[PDB]
């Protein structure tokens, strides 16, 4: 009998309740005050142009059919009640494949306040598309969107709202960051209208401003690229007569850059435009190829095949000595121009 009081309340709420019809159908728009508490910002898969996000996706709307009076002001209920009531058919416009976790039970809470207000929260892992323009990659920053709205109901039928000030209606947990190669600088939220083949729809946009960390790509790509440029420019300080040795330097170094250039792309989508690393690779490719062409030029004028001993001996090539200082200055000037151009953008 102690719980029979609340059983008779829940039975009354669903008596004659048609969960196919939205609140205020034909009477008013259904305002759904939404909020997102990002328990953890999942990893970003640049290869698939998508990111994962774990959220306590909160939705609140007024349903006058669920007004009740009783010894409690807020009925805290399990998910089983949620499927019995109308809930917004919210979906994510750029959602690729999302999971509504239900271990051990459906991770959904449904609180019904005495005035009819509902608080319908669910735990989701949303895998959303992030259209990524990798022009400045890896020194790039992306405003990955998280758009959601009603799938069926037009703006005249349901409209979405932020439950607090828009700046204060998307909260990220303090330790909730599963990003490896990114920093969540923050989020900006906006609400607009999207015109579709079926009608006008309200779309709540959230732009998570992610800035990539170059720490991985500096170790993985730039240092091997730079040390390959410096490995090639070691050949200048070797005697010209050592034809196999300097030849091994150029072919191995050029071979290394081809491996590195192929390797770098493999972690990226197969975009048809050059990224900022491609130009760095291309210039580094130019600097190792020039260092083999430089040796080929030196080998052209290498009038003798025997190095110094202890009977004219080949002099040190003026191309080498100029290349000794020119190639590390030109390579250094390129880095200053390259790094300054990309690092100082905003």
């Amino acid at each position, epitope marked *: 009998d102690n719980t029979t009081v609340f059983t008779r309340i829940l039975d009354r709420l669903l008596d004659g309740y048609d969960n196919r019809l939205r609140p205020g159908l034909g009477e008013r728009v259904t305002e759904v005050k939404t909020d997102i508490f990002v328990t953890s910002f999942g990893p970003v898969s640049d290869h698939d142009m998508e990111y994962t996000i774990d959220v306590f996706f909160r939705q609140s709307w*007024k349903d006058e059919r669920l007004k009740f009076k009783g010894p409690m002001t807020v009925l805290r209920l399990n998910n089983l009640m949620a499927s019995k009531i109308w809930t917004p058919d919210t979906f994510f416009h750029n959602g690729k494949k999302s999971v509504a976790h239900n271990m051990t039970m459906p991770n959904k809470l449904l609180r019904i306040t005495e*005035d009819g207000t509902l608080l319908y929260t669910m735990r989701l892992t949303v895998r959303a598309e992030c259209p990524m323009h990798l022009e400045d990659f890896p020194m790039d920053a992306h405003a990955c969107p998280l758009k959601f709205g009603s799938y069926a109901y037009t703006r005249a039928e349901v409209v979405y*709202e*932020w439950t607090r*000030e*828009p*700046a*204060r209606s998307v909260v990220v947990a303090e330790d909730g960051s599963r990003l490896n190669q990114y920093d969540l600088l923050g989020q*900006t*939220v*906006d*609400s*607009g209208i999207v015109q579709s083949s079926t009608g006008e729809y309200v779309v709540m946009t959230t732009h998570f401003h992610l800035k990539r960390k170059i720490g991985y790509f500096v170790i993985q790509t730039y240092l091997p690229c730079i040390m390959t440029v410096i490995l090639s420019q070691v050949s200048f300080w070797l005697n010209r007569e050592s034809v196999p040795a300097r030849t091994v330097f150029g072919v191995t170094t050029v071979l290394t850059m081809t491996t590195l250039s192929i390797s770098a792309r493999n972690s990226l989508p197969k975009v048809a435009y050059a990224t900022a690393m491609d130009w760095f690779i291309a210039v580094c490719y130019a600097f190792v190829f020039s260092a083999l062409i430089e040796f080929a030029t030196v080998n052209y004028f290498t009038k003798r095949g025997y190095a110094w001993d202890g009977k004219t001996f080949n002099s040190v090539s003026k191309i080498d000595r100029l290349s000794r200082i020119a190639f590390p200055l030109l390579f250094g000037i390129f880095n200053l121009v390259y790094w300054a151009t990309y690092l100082n953008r905003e």
Partner: antibody
Amino acid sequence: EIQLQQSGPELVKPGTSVKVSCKASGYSFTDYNMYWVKQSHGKSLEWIGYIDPYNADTTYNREFKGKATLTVDKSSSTAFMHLNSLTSEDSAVYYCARKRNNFYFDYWGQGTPLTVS
Amino acid sequence: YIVMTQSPKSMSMSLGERVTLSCRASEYVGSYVSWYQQKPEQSPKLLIYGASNRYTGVPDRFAGSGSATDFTLTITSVQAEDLADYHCGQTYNYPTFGGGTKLEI
């Protein structure tokens, strides 16, 4: 129709306290928040705070934190603002602004001049 | 908070002449920007919300647009009743209205 009717003109001296009310009509009070706004003579509008009428939660501006208190009567539709330790700088006209959405302030109050001298 | 700055503090546009009123935000506000009309001894009256939309029961002469941190209200041809102060607000965060802009003939 909707119409917000505030208290009216007030005359006071520094150090006293004044309470100004903001009645609401034409819509359910608990549905929407109520913001309070100050505007000195020929100056930009300034936000004091807002009160959630349902649960009576309040948020205040840092400039007016501790200077004013926001209270609400759910039974009779009215939002109350009380000022204490008044000074000459607080002589201004005060408005109460409904917030229909997170986009705009739908209906504003008539305006309550305040005089301190 | 976020401060809104009306660049032209005052104007002298003639009746029946196009006029532009600029509004700037110190940082992002999205589309959450609105314009209100403050006649002397009258409370503000909303004209433009969402930085592009127009409140119901408003003349079509009031046209406003803008992007993030750059918002403009343009009146194609002002009338006698259109002479008043204009305030641009932002509700992307705790609300903060900008300095008024007034018109003269």
